[PDB]
């Protein structure tokens, strides 16, 4: 859907977890 970042460990401050992108990675989408 939206361009989100596969964040390893955790997302950045302000990014919302949209799901996961792997064992080490979370799928985090930016707030802006």
UniProtKB/Swiss-Prot annotation:
Q: Where in the chain are disulfide-linked cysteines found?
A: 4-29, 6-21, 11-28
Tissue specificity here reads:
Paneth cells of the small bowel.
Q: Indicate where this protein resides in the cell.
A: Secreted; Cytoplasmic vesicle, Secretory vesicle
Tell me where on the tree of life, at the top rank, the source sits.
Eukaryota
**Role summary:** Host-defense peptide that has antimicrobial activity. Exhibits activity against Gram-negative E.coli (in vitro). Probably contributes to the antimicrobial barrier function of the small bowel mucosa.
What protein family is recorded?
A: Belongs to the alpha-defensin family.
Name listed for the protein in its UniProt record: Defensin alpha 4
Range within the parent protein: 61 to 92 of 92
């Amino acid at each position: 859907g939206l361009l989100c970042y596969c964040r390893k460990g955790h997302c950045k401050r302000g990014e919302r977890v949209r799901x996961t992108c792997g064992i080490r990675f979370l799928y985090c989408c930016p707030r802006r």
